Design a protein around this ligand. Sequence first.
Ligand SMILES: [Mg+2]
Ligand SMILES: [Mg+2]
Lengths: 102, 1340, 50, 552
Amino acid sequence: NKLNRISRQMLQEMGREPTPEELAERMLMPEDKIRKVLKIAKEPISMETPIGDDEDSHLGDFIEDTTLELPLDSATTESLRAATHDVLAGLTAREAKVLRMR
Amino acid sequence: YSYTEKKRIRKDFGKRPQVLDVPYLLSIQLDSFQKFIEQDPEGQYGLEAAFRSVFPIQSYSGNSELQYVSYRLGEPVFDVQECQIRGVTYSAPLRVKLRLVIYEREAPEGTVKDIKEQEVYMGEIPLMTDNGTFVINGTERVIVSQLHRSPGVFFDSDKGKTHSSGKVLYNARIIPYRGSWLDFEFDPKDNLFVRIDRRRKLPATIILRALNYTTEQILDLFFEKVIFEIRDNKLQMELVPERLRGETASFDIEANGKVYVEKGRRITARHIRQLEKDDVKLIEVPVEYIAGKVVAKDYIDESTGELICAANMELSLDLLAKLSQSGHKRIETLFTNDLDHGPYISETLRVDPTNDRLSALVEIYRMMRPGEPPTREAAESLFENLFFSEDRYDLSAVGRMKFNRSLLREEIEGSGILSKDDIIDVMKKLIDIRNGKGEVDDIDHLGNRRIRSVGEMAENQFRVGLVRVERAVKERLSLGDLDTLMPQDMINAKPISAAVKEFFGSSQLSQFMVQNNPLSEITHKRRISALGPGGLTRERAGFEVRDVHPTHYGRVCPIETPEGPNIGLINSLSVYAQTNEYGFLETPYRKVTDGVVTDEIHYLSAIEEGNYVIAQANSNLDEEGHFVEDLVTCRSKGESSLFSRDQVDYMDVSTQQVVSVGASLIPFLEHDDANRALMGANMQRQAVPTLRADKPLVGTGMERAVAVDSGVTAVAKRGGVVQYVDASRIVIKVNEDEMYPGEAGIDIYNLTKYTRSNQNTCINQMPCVSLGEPVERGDVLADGPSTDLGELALGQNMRVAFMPWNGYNFEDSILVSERVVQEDRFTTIHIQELACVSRDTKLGPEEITADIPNVGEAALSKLDESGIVYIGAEVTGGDILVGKVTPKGETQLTPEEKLLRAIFGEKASDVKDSSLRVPNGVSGTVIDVQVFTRDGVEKDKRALEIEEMQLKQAKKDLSEELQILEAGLFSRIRAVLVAGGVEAEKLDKLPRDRWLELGLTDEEKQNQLEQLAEQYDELKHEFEKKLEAKRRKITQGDDLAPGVLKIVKVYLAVKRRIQPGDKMAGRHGNKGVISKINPIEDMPYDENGTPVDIVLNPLGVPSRMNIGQILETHLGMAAKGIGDKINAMLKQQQEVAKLREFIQRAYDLGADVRQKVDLSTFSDEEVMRLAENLRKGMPIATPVFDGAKEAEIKELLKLGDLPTSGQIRLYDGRTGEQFERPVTVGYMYMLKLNHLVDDKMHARSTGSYSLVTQQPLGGKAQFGGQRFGEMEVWALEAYGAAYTLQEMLTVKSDDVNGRTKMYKNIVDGNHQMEPGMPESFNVLLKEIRSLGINIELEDE
Amino acid sequence: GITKASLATESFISAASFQETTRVLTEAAVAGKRDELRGLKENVIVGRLI
Amino acid sequence: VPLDGGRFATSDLNDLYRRVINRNNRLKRLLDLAAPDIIVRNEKRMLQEAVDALLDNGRRGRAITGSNKRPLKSLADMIKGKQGRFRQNLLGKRVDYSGRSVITVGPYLRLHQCGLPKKMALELFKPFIYGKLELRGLATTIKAAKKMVEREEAVVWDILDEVIREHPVLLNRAPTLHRLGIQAFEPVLIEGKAIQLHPLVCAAYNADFDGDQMAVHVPLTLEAQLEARALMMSTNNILSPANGEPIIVPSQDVVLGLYYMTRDCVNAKGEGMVLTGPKEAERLYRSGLASLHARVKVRITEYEKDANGELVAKTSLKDTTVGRAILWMIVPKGLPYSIVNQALGKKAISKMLNTCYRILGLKPTVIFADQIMYTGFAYAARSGASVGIDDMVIPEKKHEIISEAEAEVAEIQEQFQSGLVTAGERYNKVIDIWAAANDRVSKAMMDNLQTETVINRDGQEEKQVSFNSIYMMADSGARGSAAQIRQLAGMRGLMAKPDGSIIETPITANFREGLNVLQYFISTHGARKGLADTALKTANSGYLTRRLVDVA
Ligand SMILES: [Mg+2]
Ligand SMILES: [Mg+2]
């Protein structure tokens, strides 16, 4: 709340509006925390916010899954076992046991 | 004839002389905004007008008033170029002087103290470019002019369909400029209704009560009075001898001692004549006729003081007695006629629940706000605020004007609100139409269609800003302390600033300027839209408004409109059209007095033109300009017919004025079907500029006007001689007549160099003049993209042959010789902006460092120490533009990966590779790099180098200005010193700086030398301040978004040529997609051996009736003929005589054209340069409807030495044998639209996925798969393909398990699917189950 | 009529597609109606063989 | 889920769910505080409203999401939509293994295949390429394979031709209407980014080349490959399921080729001579000895299977031309020479294909169709057909006809000023004579245009059907029709004002002449209402098929 208020006098006083470090001096605190405070303060945007074209295209339709695993990798995972399991039968029974162990 | 015309002159066919030349094509855009922001010392539209409405603002009754003084626009923060690079909006600060007055308590008014607060800043409003575009964030945007329904009253029909009883209805609608709508409408029972806005229907009379009108005055207003006298006993009556028309006699009717008519004889012209001339005022009547008649006023019994009858009640034979015995002599009744005067208003009162003013006011307030209790102050106040409040209601000037005009009033200007007189007059007029007297207007007429535009529209938004701040301003002045707070602490910026920003930023009328092409620009800035706010919608209307209207003549182009969902909802402005003074559309016309055609032009609006008889653009007059024929084709009122010699009041200005800038550029348009012409002018705007600006060989003559009027070219500010010519800049030394006395000067044009367009095309200027060449003011200095020597070249004309070629042209497909791609002529240059952002994540900040996990030196080759690609490194797909790395710690890898790192001994980094890399397949040369940095983060090495470089280049740039400027100024001092004390050889020896001392003998030359001193020192000082700001602007830390530490924007210039798949079209609506690129060997050649560039399929010609494209071909060939011919006499070096003779012959052509020509031109240097420009071809101008004719075309082909048929024999380059039949070969101007195949082409195997629904979604630009629809499903359902369909909607898209299980099988070599259940449907189960529904999958 | 006859469909999942969804689900949810699939529209929805 | 710049984004349900929770929880508190009835009652109503807003918002007041005017979307709106479910509504789910680009011709293609851009096929078969690459051991593992195609080593191209060979791809155009809107093709590798599409199919797709784009789909599972080949393959549908007539009928360029090919003039090189068979007929033509159209008897061998499933042979001297003789080389076995002995317009050339199918079966019909196209394009290219401005012949009698009809209106006009005829009667009268005039001009230029070529063979004179360029197109069935031609040479029509009341002063000019200002302006309405009507008729059609497929 204090921040909105400060931007007010300084809004017309500075003629455009105070710089990110301006209200920082106006405020008691470390003043770089302004940035940190400013992030969490934003309210989340409706994932249903209709974007462009109005075509029921909605913001949420554009949010990709980053936790997924592309198959071109999962495929190489199924392979990497077959790779390493083979090279470990190519070694002595104890080296495979010792390496599978370490 | 001008200087850039001496270089090349276009042979102009056509007869009709141009009386007026095309004005500035950007007039509308520029004039409008110019009226908005300006100091207008009166109520004319502008920031001034919107201020004076809501001002002055007083607190609530507290007698604390705040008034408004004046405003000013501060200097722009960045100029247009600077504003574009950084991303800011091009804007100026609005500084407004405010005066706060306080009345003493309690006072006869006077001020304790008044603080005049100087210019409080509210918002920065964007500014319009010299070309009429806006820059919102580093991006050019155009605001389309709007066409809406004009404010006023309008009476409509809504015939036919209503109630399916026929009968039509008649409704009036008052549409004010601001405030609620007032609607009046009838019903099948002829009861008048009213609804405010679209709200509940209400009986009309309730407003009269709300206007404080009791029933008696309602009866007294709309109806006449039938006076009844009881004289002796039982009922005499007053008679207007005319009232008996259209009705039959009710009793024995006799007066003036002579019985004129008995009972049962209808009243014709006979009966009325007798009464009028015999002056029959009073007759004796029976007591039964009033059984139906409604009493006018109230009549009470004098004795009992009790009400005998209320107003508007039907009398009976018995009722007459009770008011007769009360001593009533007079009983007033209504005049009712079912043809002339309908008993409509009367029947509405019986449906009126109200009685008095408050009742009506309550019933209105409860209509508007139902559910809430009415209040005396609420009902009274609300009604007073709707149409009677200066704040919440305005019709403005036009509303009042059209209002007054449609009501047949005298005053064209009046109150900006409604008066009791105003509403009532409309009601009277609406009834008159229902009575058969008067007619209804129609919405589609362009006299009722008003055109707004940027200046006006932005003004409305600024008003909204002031009202949403108004509520705030009163609120603070309530509690204000005496002289502590001031007219700053109250007024904020953001409320006003966010209003205007919300408009320029995302309103439907503000769009990216479709800028691949000057024609595209100029046709965007002249555009109308009936869409957006205050307009109709695609879904609402309705083919009448979409259709072309008779009033569109000379105002709106009939043929340039989109062919999509909104047809006729956009249009384009005509060529000569202008916005009327009041805001309508008026067009030029020529005043024809008596039988002579005068050259005074007269601009007539849609309604003005109505009454006049207007002649035709094509008509033959001569000598004094008498119409040759005794009768001429003309249009007078909505229709066209033959008109007499002296009838015509006016005549068309030009043969062109019906069309638009787009359509006026199509040659032989008169020969093209309207569909293909539309399509032609629609596609002509998509033509990407080419590598070599060519010129149209076949043309109209607008191309000069389009090039200059669009800012793409560089036009001379003042005339003079070119001092210096570089590919960078141009310095003109002004002629003395054009030069200002002070400062001397030279006008320096800084050319735009290679840079990105909105469509990712290349916009680059080239100098068209040579060292030391005379140029006069208004001469073309430099071509822009797609402009040649002052003309408009949207593509390159080329040799074309019509013939099926082995199916390679099958439908519209085009077969192009390799000569074209080798000549690199249709090659096009694209400039792409790629960005790399270093953000901040909860795990840590992202680094732009050149240290990237798991990459070799070949990657790092193209990178400097800092991680940014060098300028000029040509790059291809996959190359690293900007090294970027994001923190990810403690990966938690797996056993076999852990073994992998152990064996190959790589230290797996705590950092992940985010670097910006070239998209797959796009390849180009890096022409620029930008680094924006947050204020406070240390600029890395490269970023500092750049900033230092930009600084040196800036210093060099400013100094170059000063050096040439100083010489130009000192060069004037030298000449004035020579006028009275010339020492020529003596003067230029000593240092030039030591000149300012020498004075002169008494004369103005002493004050002139005096003058140049003053202006010199300012230059010394203005330069200094200019340098400093520039330096500061570089060093100032650039502002970024929240979370972004730094941004690297890389600019690639890709050069794409032509390949199968590009879309190409001529101006005639013939599309095409290049099919094969053929060797010159297989190209058809003529006997002389010259191959043909393009082979078109003739089959496209007959079906689509674009016939202009053929003439254009034929004539095109002829033009090329004169070139080859000239190319021979010049390669012969015959001499000026032989050459001059032949060129003169060409420009005449057979008789009766309008071109004129030489030999006035200096016979050697001026003539010879022109011939060099014609050897490629001789440019020809076919005016739109005045264009050339076959004979002239055929005649020009005779001079060409080329056949009249326009066809020759052609030989296949393969078999070498002839072609049976002659084939048409010629030169067609052809455009490359930007539908380029390596834009369109997309393919995806396995990409990213949407999270919410697991579905293919492009995140890397490896695009989500093609969208598979319902109709496409049916196609599979009609086929037996079950497995194709299952795999389509399960494993190929939605099955998050099955997809991976599938992929592994594809590489294993097993084509199967283990489908499972789609996640979309699997979600549907939870959504149903998330409600109270138990949905199960039964059985087994 | 064609549009009226398509209204009546045994499968409610099919009806929920092209009809008014709210009304279909409610009117079906009360009766405890059991969709046996068997039709085309529904099998496409659940993603099995037509 | 988070976004860039550290901001967050969330579904509207949270705001709704949160509310129901708060209120629910507050109510739980208000029970233990024993609040008065008036409050807990109010709290219950508020909770009731809140749950309702969660389930289906809009059956009450329509609560709006926080700080945003737009109402927050509830669970019923997640299922609901336009129309019914979004899931199954068009569109309809995005699908992997697909692509698209601008399409072009490729007449060299056989009817069962299509040109596929090199890069498109690379990115599409990416998993297959990986598997085939590691099947032969050219790549150690899938990862190395990924790097190979990403490196685009030259060696992969031969491997792609293997994985491509027998593997159909599905091609689709934008308004898929009937089942032929999707057809399976065999891939042919093409340098370049454009899709090449067999010309004969352009009719079934309604695919012009004006820049239309087509989408490609790869049939992954074995069952999908065999569905595409045995059902959706191009060659398996040559006949419309709507009506049994072939939809692969050669389109325009090809039929002008065959029309110009089998046609005959009166006197041309090779007139009257005789040849052993079509082989030496082409030998006559190709060498420049005989004209494509000249009357000639040649020995032909036709076939008739009129036995019991068995082919009879018959040889005779048929009276024909050189072109028809040459063309006979393509016609397989049991078709009679009668089918090719005619002029071969677009109408006959389809019924040719129909009969070939209904007699010899599918396989002979497919390869037949191919041959017809190849020869059609080829000979059409030889023909050197073109269109000049002098190819459109205006009747010599036009100006005279207009004047006579111009005299009639002035007759009827004199009758209206003198009251001999009523105003309404006037409008209809004038409209009829102008209409009648149009027919006159149309049927003048049609006669002149059609036969006026008047030529001589050895004897005196004679006249045949014109060889004029524009006529051949319309007669053959290639393009254009007497109606459209009438607008080029003869006067074009009487346009109609927006009102629909056809104007009593028609368009007296045509496209070969110029149209003046008024005529064009009046022409505009017909075009725009045409585009609007069609663009709307587009919408009417779609809804209709919808209602239809829903009921069936
Ligand atoms: Mg087509
Ligand atoms: Mg198309």
